[PDB]
Design a binder for this molecule. Structure first.
Ligand code: PLP
Length: 315
C-alpha cells in the first residue's frame, strides 16, 4: 500500500483560546524520515519500484527532507540510492543517510548545487527523484486530506495553512480537497519573503524564475513553482501569503516551547500565521465555531544550534 503513516491531528488549546478559533495541527514530523515528504516521495518511490523493479538506483540531491525520504524508501524497498548533499550539511542528516545504506556524496555550496550535481549522476537504470514537480508526488501528498476528512468528522475547516516550496504539497492538498468534495476550503499558501516564487507567479500570471535566493526556511527555497500549482490556483480558493524569516524563527521557538517538538523554519512559516494572529487579518470571519488546520510539515534541517542562532538573530 504505502510507505507513509497516518499522523495525529492535535488540538492546540492555548492557540485556540488566544485566536478565538479552533486550531488543529496535522503532525507530519511523525512520518518515517521526519517530514511530510514521506507521503509524496513515498508514492513516487513505491511506484518506481512497481514499474521498474529493484535493480534501479534512486538518485537525489533535491533538498534535505527529500533526500532523507528517498534514503528511507530505498532501504524499505531494497533498492540502491545515490544521495548528494551540500558540503556543509547537518551531520545527523549525513549519519541517517549512511545508516540507511545509501551512497552519500558531499557536493555544492547549497541544495540547488547538490541537485545540479545529482542530476549528472543518473545512469541508464537510475531514476532522479524530484522534490515537488511530479504527478506521483501530488498523488502521494493528497493522502493528507483523506486523513483530515476523517479526523475532522467530515466538517470542512475554515482554512488549511500549507507551506509552499516548489508546490508539490500544495498541489496534493488542492487535489485532495477536490476529491473530498471540499472544493470551497481556502488554502493559505505560505512562503517566506526570501523565496516567494508562488506568490510572485500568482501576481504575474506566469512562472517567475528566481536565482540565488536564501532563507532559513530551506525546504521552501525553489527557483520556480510547479506549473500545476499556478493552474490549480485559478480553479480553487488559494491565498498566497509571505512571512519574514524572523516570524518563521519565532514560530519554531514557540512550537518547541509549547508542543516540545523541533520543526524546520519551513513548518514554522505556516505556524507563524497563528502565533502572530495574522490568520485573523486573512480570514476576518473566524469564530470559536470554526476550525483552522495547520500542516506541520516537520523536517530534519533543524537542531539545538539552529535554535541558538534563531534566538540570537531574530528575537
Ligand atoms: C517539502 C516541504 C514543504 C513544502 O514543499 P513543496 O516543495 O512545496 O512540496 C514544507 N515543509 C517541509 C519541511 C518540506 O520538507
Amino acid at each position: 500500500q504505502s510507505l507513509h503513516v497516518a499522523t495525529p491531528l492535535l488540538h492546540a488549546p492555548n492557540l485556540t483560546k488566544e485566536l478565538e478559533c479552533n486550531v488543529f495541527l496535522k503532525m507530519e514530523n511523525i512520518q518515517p524520515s521526519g517530514s511530510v515528504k514521506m507521503r509524496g516521495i513515498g508514492a513516487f518511490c513505491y511506484q518506481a519500484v512497481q514499474t521498474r523493479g529493484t535493480n534501479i538506483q534512486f538518485v537525489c540531491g533535491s533538498g534535505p527532507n527529500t533526500v532523507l525520504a528517498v534514503s528511507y524508501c530505498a532501504r524499505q524497498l531494497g533498492v540502491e540510492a545515490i544521495i548528494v548533499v551540500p558540503k556543509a550539511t547537518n551531520e545527523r542528516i549525513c549519519q541517517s543517510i549512511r545508516t540507511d545504506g545509501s551512497h552519500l556524496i558531499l557536493y555544492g555550496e547549497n541544495w540547488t548545487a547538490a541537485e545540479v550535481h545529482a542530476r549528472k549522476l543518473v545512469r541508464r537504470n537510475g531514476i532522479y527523484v524530484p522534490s515537488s514537480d511530479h504527478a506521483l508526488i501530488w498523488q502521494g501528498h493528497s493522502t493528507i486530506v483523506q486523513e483530515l476528512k476523517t479526523q475532522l468528522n467530515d466538517n470542512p475547516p475554515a482554512a488549511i495553512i500549507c507551506p509552499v516550496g516548489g508546490g508539490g504539497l500544495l498541489n496534493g492538498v488542492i487535489m485532495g480537497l477536490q476529491e473530498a468534495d471540499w472544493k470551497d476550503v481556502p488554502v493559505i499558501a505560505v512562503e517566506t519573503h526570501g523565496s516567494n516564487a508562488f506568490q510572485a507567479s500568482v501576481v504575474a500570471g506566469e512562472l517567475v524564475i528566481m536565482e540565488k535566493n536564501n532563507t532559513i526556511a530551506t525546504s521552501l527555497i525553489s527557483k520556480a513553482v510547479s506549473s500545476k500549482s499556478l493552474e490549480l490556483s485559478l480553479n480553487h480558493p488559494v491565498v498566497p501569503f509571505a512571512v519574514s524569516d524572523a516570524m518563521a524563527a519565532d514560530a519554531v521557538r514557540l512550537f518547541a516551547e509549547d508542543f516540545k517538538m523541533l520543526v524546520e523554519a519551513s513548518a514554522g512559516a505556516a505556524l507563524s500565521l497563528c502565533y502572530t494572529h495574522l490568520i485573523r487579518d486573512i480570514l476576518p470571519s473566524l469564530s470559536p465555531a470554526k476550525d483552522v488546520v495547520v500542516l506541520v510539515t516537520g523536517g530534519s534541517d533543524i537542531s539545538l544550534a539552529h535554535l541558538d542562532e534563531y534566538r540570537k538573530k531574530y528575537m
